[PDB]
Symmetry: D2
Subunit: 253 residues, 4 copies
């Protein structure tokens, strides 16, 4: 028997097989979880991608900017898992920031519409997804979104850092809401995962700072962590952040 | 001599004489600073308010959602303080969240359009004001914005809390940029001011919500040369409350 | 199959069946783990308590102030689980502060001798237990100690709070060392357990002080292979309370 | 007129002219502060050291392990500043950890008696000094101790890191006590100050991470910060930590 046996879990954020949500999905199904999956735009592609998953799973469309997608999302899931059934888990692995706000572009050159669009997608959508889905979730359930420690500024990450700080603050509020349904809300703050010279420097220090090391080619440790929060072995943790970063954020040098 | 003697400081955010920015300006002027002041919509009203300060100061219009007010800010400021002169301090004391994402409204019912507008005015504008004014600031200078500790979730504050968390993240990126200019960037996270009961109890030294002067003082401390090694950071002017659980 | 199936786990700190360590052990045994258990002074009494667990387990004496109990611990553990075998988990659920530095006594009136003894038993022993048992642990293993969030000051807890702050600092240094062994080291910061009212109110999911099982579960989660990328860290088993201000 | 005019301030922790407390003393006197100074053992040396200070100041003996020194400390200060006078400021710049617990020695090889002695001197003494001195302090007053950010483990620092975490937790409690007298208690978390290859790496990254840079040969920025807290321009901050580290702790890379 597996970690997530009989639990019905919605996973968003699969675009390729390198996506963190592919591995979360992969590992959740390995542990006996019944998935519903959502995707944004390139649906034809992600049909073939999610076929490379261990088990079959209905695939729905969900642009988190789209207001019709959100209002219909409860009924579409319910149809997909069968009326009378409910979700025990929800995975948010969605994030986007335009290259105007992340990377080489100077922090001060990002226009607000672009920053606004990235904050919409990477932080606010955690609330509106929880809002869509909370009415069709069982007590004991668990919502989990993906994070990248924003405690300190770093190069490149720029406005995506700022989006992740907003996400964290959003997580604490969603938990207030989720808790009235007896449902937990947490973030997994992951280390860098391989989905210019400066960026190599960060990733390098990550493995060096990590007391147990950090392999950027391996997404499984993060998938596992998420399934831990989706399981029942972490039942008194909510509003919170769990770090799957090799322990790097706990070490200065 | 005064704490800010001979320093030129931009003070944004006066709308009333209850405004934190008003007391900051008042104290900065009490301590010898030369101010330039900015105002949003009600210019005539705050002209009447800004006439209540100890000393006179130029009043520029600044709506931080307005791209033309931003790209022209440097030039307008220069004209006020005189060419060749640069600012030594900038006060961001601007916030706004529509009532749809702050108050009695449930946290899930705030439209993005409204939360995006609040985050624009409360967070992103700390960066775009720095962007504008950094070219016209002196080495050793200081940019300070107003904060309310968002490390934990709380009733009512809702998406403004989310705004403040973003500001804190922005402040750390603004100090990256500011440092290229020899300039500092810090936040004062202040207790609740009457522009709560738990706040005063928790505060080891106590907390008066009817007094903004202790907060104004902490801002001025940051605008001076007595905290020259702190940037990207947050000074808590809160009676100590956030250091205490109960 | 069980969560800890086939894993050998040291559980320290049982003195009663109200002890957090008792429920941890009970749950680890419910989930298929093989235990070795340690006890301080009252060995016969906890023999009687440890007979109340689902499955039987060897009971070693361990006073962490005793240097001879430490240097002999590895050898004694090996003898219990059989040579060639190594532990996969270690539970530090030991704390003590004399009443002179925890309770009604004022914070300034605790002698150092008493605070030093409490910090010895509550903090430094997390390191010396790791020091002892690291040589006899398998790669992929996990060391977990018990914590109570000390990030803010609070009445009564006093110098035990200071102990817990030191533990947290020690845990981060223990994970440095543990990592050389492919082993993890983390703290569970738990809510108040009946071995407060504010705690349940703040907890978004609620907090039952009469139930230690949700905390025991979180410990077991850390002893398993489902959090393999977390070390030097703190998991809060507190109903979410510490994420909420009011 | 200066920052600290008419304020009577006790400064501990001068052993040489490179000490952070020499500069705190130096800068406090420059700003019109009336000092009382304490020292540990080598009193003859620190008499000549403190002569190189701008202004004269009574010099008392204070071993913070010594229980007689502490119980007599209020009366000795009072004699030194004149009966009826009181202290407006107190500076704790004391720290020690034996080399068994700090540097090359493996973390696990430090014996508790040594760690216990370093924790006594670097953390517990902040309480017992506040205890000695609080009865002879004016409302509006300020106690300030020296800190080195312990949020994360780093090499070398080892058990001194642990001592500083204890200090921080102690600061939050002293503020509870100090507040009944209307006196603030804060820490200045300073960057590294020049008072093997690995240690050079830390100091280097400090200046690199510091958005405004960090000069390890210059103690004045830290002295200034302390005088800020000793002044009246930070009157609603207590139980707290101020970082004079160039902004380095706010930056990952
Ligand atoms: N990649 C890393 O190093 C790592 C580390 C920490 C955190 N994270 C976070 O994990 C999450 C997924 O990361 P990833 O590396 O797997 O990225 P990915 O590019 O593989 O996946 C991101 C997903 O966001 C989806 N998306 C974008 N806009 C959307 C919209 N408008 N509506 C619905 N979906 C939308 C995309 O379709 C995509 O599947 C992100 O939130 C990311 O910030 C990743
Ligand atoms: N009052 C409190 O308890 C408290 C506590 C902590 C932090 N703060 C912060 O202090 C700052 C000022 O708050 P205050 O209490 O003086 O409130 P206030 O209402 O008096 O000031 C807010 C100011 O922001 C200005 N503003 C709004 N939209 C603007 C725009 N688009 N462009 C330019 N200016 C705009 C307003 O005109 C006003 O002067 C804010 O950042 C607020 O978040 C307040
Ligand atoms: N009860 C709570 O609300 C709570 C909350 C958070 C954290 N904790 C932590 O959980 C851990 C265990 O607490 P508990 O509530 O089960 O209390 P408990 O009194 O049942 O357990 C404390 C244990 O420490 C042992 N101990 C004391 N001195 C020792 C020594 N010198 N050598 C070896 N063992 C020694 C005792 O024998 C006892 O079994 C402690 O670390 C405590 O700080 C407790
Ligand atoms: N040096 C740095 O890079 C730096 C950075 C951060 C924090 N700090 C802290 O600042 C403080 C002073 O540091 P420094 O670099 O000036 O060191 P320093 O060696 O020059 O001064 C340390 C002082 O502690 C005193 N002392 C030791 N044991 C004592 C005792 N038993 N009783 C009374 N006094 C005793 C010594 O006499 C000495 O004057 C320390 O707490 C240190 O940890 C220093
Ligand atoms: O958060 C992240 C952190 C890292 Cl180190 C790498 C990738 C991350 O995730 C993203 C960043 C930007 C955009 Cl547009 C989309 C995604 Cl999915
Ligand atoms: O941050 C704040 C904290 C508190 Cl206790 C009270 C008011 C605050 O600030 C605001 C809240 C909403 C809007 Cl529309 C404008 C401002 Cl200035
Ligand atoms: O950490 C704790 C937190 C709480 Cl709410 C209650 C008890 C705790 O733990 C202790 C306190 C004092 C002693 Cl002598 C022994 C232990 Cl185990
Ligand atoms: O805290 C410190 C931090 C740094 Cl980077 C350098 C020195 C420090 O201070 C000390 C460390 C050990 C001992 Cl025995 C005495 C003192 Cl004064």
């Amino acid at each position: 028997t597996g970690l997530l046996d009989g639990k019905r879990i919605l996973v968003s954020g699969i675009i390729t097989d390198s996506s963190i949500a592919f591995h979360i999905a992969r590992v959740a199904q390995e542990q006996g979880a019944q998935l519903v999956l959502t995707g944004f735009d390139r649906l034809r592609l992600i049909q073939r991608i999610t076929d490379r998953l261990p088990a079959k799973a209905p695939l729905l469309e969900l642009d988190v900017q789209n207001e019709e997608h959100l209002a219909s999302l409860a009924g579409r899931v319910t149809e997909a898992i069968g009326a009378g059934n409910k979700l025990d888990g929800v995975v948010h692995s969605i994030g986007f920031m335009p290259q105007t706000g992340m990377g080489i572009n100077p922090f001060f050159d990002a226009p607000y519409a672009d920053v606004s669009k990235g904050i919409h997608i990477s932080a606010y959508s955690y609330a509106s997804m929880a809002k869509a889905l909370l009415p069709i979730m069982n007590p004991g359930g668990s919502i989990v979104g993906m994070d990248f420690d924003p405690s300190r500024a770093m190069p490149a990450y720029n406005w995506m850092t700022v989006a992740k700080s907003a996400l964290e603050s959003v997580n604490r509020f969603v938990a207030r809401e989720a808790g009235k349904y007896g449902v937990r809300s947490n973030l997994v703050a992951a280390g860098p995962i391989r989905t210019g010279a400066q960026i190599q420097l960060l990733e390098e220090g990550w493995d060096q700072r990590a007391p147990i090391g950090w392999n950027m080619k391996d997404a499984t440790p993060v998938a596992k962590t998420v399934c831990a929060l989706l399981s029942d072995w972490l039942p008194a943790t909510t509003g919170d952040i769990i770090y799957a970063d090799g322990g790097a954020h706990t070490q200065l040098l």
